[PDB]
């Protein structure tokens, strides 16, 4: 897309304003599932994402890989158990998308992560 880096910069300024004004972005971004399909006109799309069930019950119109998986930028994926050293053994683990605020006037930012663990209650 055109003008994209500029838009990324403006969006950064938007989120940094959001935390400054005490209307936090977690009250501005509900989460949908993982997209699988789309038909696009010129600058107008119709994405389609799962909402319940497991991802690979779907059927993508790629015809190279009908099913899919879930991809997360490894730069942000922060594991917890192996981090906290619970001494546990990896079985079925939950998955949490977490936001990190920091508040210092005119000098503030937001950190994102995707956390997995067996812990049902983060707290």
């Amino acid at each position: 897309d055109r003008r994209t880096a500029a838009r990324l910069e403006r969006f950064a300024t938007v989120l940094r304003a959001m935390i400054r004004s005490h209307v936090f972005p977690h009250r501005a971004l509900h989460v949908l599932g993982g997209l699988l399909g789309h038909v696009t006109q010129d600058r107008l799309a119709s994405v389609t994402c799962v909402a319940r069930g497991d991802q690979e019950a779907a059927r993508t119109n790629d015809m190279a890989a009908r099913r899919s998986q879930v991809h997360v930028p490894a730069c942000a994926l922060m594991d917890v158990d192996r981090e906290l050293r619970l001494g546990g053994d990896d079985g079925l683990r939950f998955a949490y998308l977490v936001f990190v605020y920091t508040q210092r006037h005119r000098r503030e930012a937001l950190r994102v992560h995707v956390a997995v663990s067996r812990l049902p209650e983060l707290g």
């Binding site: 038909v39 696009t40 006109q41 107008l44 799309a45 119709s46």
Partner: protein, 49 residues
């Protein structure tokens, strides 16, 4: 004297604009209706919407 030029209705050209039916019980009928049903055709667009 003078005759009387008789005229019938079905012989006129105007009769083809209406279907006439005798209904000897019309003096009894309350409000009567007729029911249509029509189904518009449709064409298949494409793209996002």
């Amino acid at each position: 004297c003078s005759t009387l030029s008789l005229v019938r209705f079905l012989e006129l050209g105007l009769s083809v604009a209406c279907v006439c039916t005798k209904f000897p019980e019309l003096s009894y009928v309350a409000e009567g209706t007729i029911q249509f049903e029509v189904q518009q055709p449709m064409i298949a667009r494409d793209g996002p919407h």
